[PDB]
Design a binder for these strands. Structure first.
Length: 122
RNA sequence: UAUACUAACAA
């Protein structure tokens, strides 16, 4: 008895940017956070998901990157738990680094969650 | 020049 629900990333305009980053966190703060909240399982699948085609780490495609577009598959037990979980996740992607007019100034805040956490805050 | 980027977990 497990429910699934991934978050679609606007790969039509943006590649994967901090969508995978912010959604993850340092090592995976955002991932484990929502995981400990509604008992969900965050796992981004697609091109830029497991830092296999980005910078920082080593290069060398290991997982197929021609099928999955760019989404963060979040599992759980009930649709309710995964629902609220996906909600926050959207607040991270939907806004990403080009957050709506609601904020915009805090567009870089998605990087502060990790920064202020590891002292990486300006 | 934190001018913040973090990639895990899984695949």
């Amino acid at each position: 008895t497990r429910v699934s629900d991934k978050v679609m990333i606007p790969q039509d305009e943006y590649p994967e940017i901090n969508f995978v980053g912010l959604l993850i966190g340092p090592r995976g703060n955002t991932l484990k956070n929502i995981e400990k909240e509604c008992n969900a399982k965050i796992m981004i699948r697609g091109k830029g998901s497991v830092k296999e085609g980005k910078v920082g780490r080593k290069d060398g495609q290991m997982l197929p990157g021609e099928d999955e577009p760019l989404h963060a598959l979040v599992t759980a037990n009930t649709m309710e738990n995964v629902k609220k979980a996906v909600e926050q996740i959207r607040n991270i992607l939907k806004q990403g680094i080009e957050t709506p007019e609601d904020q915009n100034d805090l567009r870089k805040m998605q990087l502060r969650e990790l920064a202020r956490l590891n002292g990486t805050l300006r």
